[PDB]
Amino acid sequence: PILSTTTLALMETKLKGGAGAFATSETHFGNYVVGEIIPLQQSMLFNS
Amino acid sequence: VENATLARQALNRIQRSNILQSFKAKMLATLFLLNRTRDRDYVLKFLTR
């Protein structure tokens, strides 16, 4: 699974999170995010 | 000391403005530093400079 959301609001909530925030999944009344199991987005960009 | 190397004629206006901006920043930074900050690196660097 890859980080995806049904509404930009939770995406903006994810973008502000600290290190490793992408991994955790979150849901709302009718919206959700699924976290990527592999921390690919943090690891790949960390190389610069 | 940090702007002595670029002025090579009479002080152009922009250089004087830079001097004034650095004046206001350094003046607000330096007031009562010994009472303000008490870590070794800052004090040693300040005295050396």
Binding site: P1, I2, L3, S4, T5, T6, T7, L8, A9, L10, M11, E12, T13, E26, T27, H28, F29, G30, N31, Y32, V34, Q41, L45 | -
Partner: protein, 49 residues
């Protein structure tokens, strides 16, 4: 990789776990999703419809 779009969570079991963090205004476009957001090669947001 696989990712879903256009899903409908049951209303008679609805719940929130982010209430203190995010708040969406009352409009059916928010209530029933029809869009998904994903990241590109560069860490930027992209939209699929």
């Amino acid at each position: 990789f696989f990712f879903p779009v256009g899903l409908y969570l049951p209303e008679d079991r609805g719940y929130t776990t982010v209430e203190s963090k995010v708040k969406l205004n009352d409009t059916v476009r928010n209530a029933l999703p029809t869009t998904a957001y994903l990241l590109n090669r560069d860490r930027a947001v992209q939209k699929i419809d």
